[PDB]
């Protein structure tokens, strides 16, 4: 089973990319996929489960209690029987925002939920801080491969670079490696050239350019991924291609993070605003 | 002294808004201002100071040690003697990203850095999570009043709403209140209407609309806030007006955060 962690800044397209890739892997490549939501926003599985928001493991522990919760309560099946979990986490202000990810991954390991017949487990992880439960997939090697979603914006590549510092720290301990940067386009000029240079500099590749396409919001309105909603659309084919390149990827690196000065110089070099 | 925490999503304009407001309070309103950076990005003070970040308290503790650090090492004076500190934070992957904020605020309280003659202390706080040292200014009441920077974008309003849940939690314990949402415009149609509706619904106000203006990047290139670079520019006068509304603000609320469904429905309404 390939254990894959998807990191990136808030709003960059982690859950859009993960869900669409998961649906494309199942539909176009006949793969068994599990999605484990590790983002307090807790909408990482909504489009696979056709719009019904799933109860988080933390909310169930809170209401029904530890020794009365079964795999069937926490794991729901959606499009093509893709298995879905939401870690959840405590209320803003209360304790560590990542604590639910620890409890959730611990329980899935305890209960053998990550079965040997899975082709892929995706952890959709909040990446604005790399600490607590948000770091666990990298620190404890729950995922062996990382892809970072970014775009042509300073804060997106700053977040990417920061996540890469996490990977450097835990590379020898955990065996975790960077598989690539996914460009989730924000439709800005220089974006592709910028990320080609960024990825070369940190020692990886931009594995795929995902276009910004209105079909994503049309599919969201119909409570679906693009592959489920309209598998003949170009955007479905883009996720099918991203899915292919992830299946076939053999380039896993310890990245070489940049200084703040190098990030700022590379932004002005490609006229990213 | 008014103790003010500025929260918001990464990249929303917390440090641009804080530094320009601080410069406008000093220049237009003759105020003594202290800025305490509580964001690991650690560039919260670059435009008040000469440029290229100041050393963080955490990096100095790491290299020279506590008990060999003086106030003068951590607090730098910039435009109109605005005093500046960067908390810093551990390396990504190493411990809690907020732990430096706690150490830094504790040390400034220890060493009496927040002198009674200060009109304003601004905490520039990472708002993508509200936990550990990022929650401390609200949980332990180091700031009494909060402004949230947002824009038309879904994740900016999601972050605002989530920060409001933090404020609700600590409202009775700490006496923390929300003073308003600052719209730092991303130059999109519907933005003003979106934030008017969002702020009414959660029981606050959009205190000020900060236009997207190229003068900010011209001033950054000159290593300056807009007030320092060009105080006669409209954008300098906008920060002077935001500064005025903060000085005169008497509307401090416990907000009523939206549910997931309410927030999602209102985001698709103003897409
Ligand atoms: N490639 C894309 N084209 C169109 N809309 C997109 C695309 N990627 C993301 N979106 C939109 O961007 C927003 C944020 O994406 P999301 O996947 O939730 O981000 P994250 O999980 O990183 O916070 C959503 O409104 C989603 O529809
Ligand atoms: N009102 C504005 N007009 C133009 N550019 C702005 C404005 N506010 C912020 N910016 C730009 O947006 C970027 C991010 O702002 P910043 O203050 O660093 O965000 P944060 O502190 O929330 O991470 C900077 O490059 C800054 O120049
Ligand atoms: S470890 Fe990270 S997520 Fe947890 S309290 Fe600290 S900043 Fe928040
Ligand atoms: Mg998400
Ligand atoms: Mg900042």
């Amino acid at each position: 089973t390939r254990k894959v962690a998807i990191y990136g800044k808030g709003g960059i397209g982690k859950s859009t990319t993960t869900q669409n890739t998961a649906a494309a892997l199942a539909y176009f490549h006949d793969k068994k996929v599990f999605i484990h939501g590790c983002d307090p926003k807790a909408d990482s599985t909504r489009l696979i489960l056709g719009g019904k928001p799933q109860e988080t493991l933390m909310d169930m522990l809170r209401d029904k209690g530890a020794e009365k919760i079964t795999n069937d309560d926490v794991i729901k099946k959606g499009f093509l029987d893709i298995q879905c979990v939401e870690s959840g986490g405590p209320e803003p202000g209360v304790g560590c925002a990542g604590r639910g990810v620890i409890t959730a991954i611990d329980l899935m390991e305890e209960n053998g939920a990550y079965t040997d017949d899975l082709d892929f487990v995706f952890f959709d992880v909040l990446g604005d801080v790399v600490c607590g439960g948000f770091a666990m997939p990298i620190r404890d090697g729950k995922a062996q491969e990382v892809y970072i979603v970014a775009s042509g914006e300073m804060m997106a590549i700053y977040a990417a670079n920061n996540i890469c510092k996490g990977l450097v720290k835990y590379a020898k301990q955990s065996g975790v490696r960077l598989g690539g940067i996914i460009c989730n386009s924000r439709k800005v000029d220089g974006e592709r050239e910028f990320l080609e240079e960024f990825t070369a500099a940190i020692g990886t590749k931009m594995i795929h350019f995902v276009p910004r396409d209105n079909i994503v919001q049309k599919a969201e309105f119909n409570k679906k991924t693009v592959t489920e909603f309209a598998p003949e659309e170009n955007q479905a084919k883009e996720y099918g291609e991203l899915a292919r390149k992830i299946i076939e990827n053999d380039e896993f690196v310890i990245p070489k993070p940049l200084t703040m000065d190098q990030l700022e110089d590379m932004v002005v070099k490609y006229g990213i605003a």
Side-chain angles (χ1 to χ4, degrees), chain A:
Chain A
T1 302
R2 288 175 65 182
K3 307 277 188 82
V4 177
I6 308 299
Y7 279 92
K9 178 187 64 90
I12 203 60
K14 291 184 301 304
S15 304
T16 302
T17 302
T18 300
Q19 289 183 98
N20 276 291
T21 299
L25 280 166
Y27 179 81
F28 295 112
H29 295 103
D30 192 50
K31 298 304 187 201
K32 286 159 196 57
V33 186
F34 193 111
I35 300 172
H36 192 325
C38 302
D39 190 326
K41 187 159 182 278
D43 63 359
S44 303
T45 66
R46 224 204 320 157
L47 296 179
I48 295 293
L49 302 179
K52 166 199 65 62
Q54 94 180 96
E55 291 304 320
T56 77
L57 176 154
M58 289 328 273
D59 284 2
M60 294 183 129
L61 260 39
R62 256 282 170 93
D63 294 329
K64 291 139 207 151
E67 70 227 39
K68 297 222 171 56
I69 42 82
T70 67
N71 272 196
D72 176 65
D73 297 306
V74 332
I75 313 164
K76 302 312 201 183
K77 274 154 132 89
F79 181 67
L80 294 180
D81 287 333
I82 295 166
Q83 293 180 253
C84 296
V85 172
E86 282 287 14
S87 300
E91 285 295 285
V94 186
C96 169
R99 181 61 178 93
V101 174
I102 294 170
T103 305
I105 294 180
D106 280 347
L107 187 62
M108 295 299 95
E109 295 217 307
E110 191 155 59
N111 293 7
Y114 304 136
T115 65
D116 50 2
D117 69 316
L118 294 171
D119 298 299
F120 288 94
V121 182
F122 288 98
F123 303 101
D124 178 353
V125 196
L126 174 140
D128 310 285
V129 301
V130 193
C131 47
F134 301 125
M136 179 191 216
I138 285 170
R139 172 192 71 214
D140 304 337
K142 309 306 192 172
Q144 290 303 94
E145 72 195 84
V146 171
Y147 301 91
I148 301 167
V149 187
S151 69
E153 58 164 288
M154 167 55 75
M155 207 54 177
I157 67 148
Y158 171 84
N161 199 59
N162 250 234
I163 293 152
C164 288
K165 292 170 178 195
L167 292 178
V168 169
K169 192 67 184 55
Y170 292 131
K172 287 304 192 276
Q173 277 194 15
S174 67
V176 70
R177 294 293 181 273
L178 181 61
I181 304 296
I182 301 159
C183 184
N184 193 40
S185 174
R186 72 156 184 163
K187 226 178 208 149
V188 304
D189 293 333
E191 170 162 62
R192 188 190 283 281
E193 290 71 41
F194 177 50
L195 281 180
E196 234 66 81
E197 180 100 328
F198 175 67
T199 58
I202 66 170
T204 190
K205 53 174 177 185
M206 177 195 84
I207 191 169
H208 197 70
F209 179 103
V210 177
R212 203 82 182 187
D213 193 319
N214 280 185
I215 198 60
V216 167
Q217 284 77 39
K218 294 204 190 283
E220 276 165 349
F221 176 79
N222 285 99
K223 322 312 281 147
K224 292 174 175 134
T225 61
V226 176
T227 290
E228 182 177 5
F229 180 63
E232 282 169 329
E233 285 283 309
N234 278 1
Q235 189 70 346
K237 289 165 94 146
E238 292 289 1
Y239 292 120
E241 184 60 357
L242 174 47
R244 186 184 63 74
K245 288 163 148 180
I246 288 167
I247 290 162
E248 290 197 57
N249 194 6
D250 59 4
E251 300 183 275
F252 301 98
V253 298
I254 304 166
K256 292 148 47 206
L258 299 186
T259 64
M260 190 53 96
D261 281 338
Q262 292 180 296
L263 296 176
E264 291 180 332
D265 178 56
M266 197 175 290
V267 159
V268 54
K269 184 173 168 181
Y270 290 94
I272 270 80

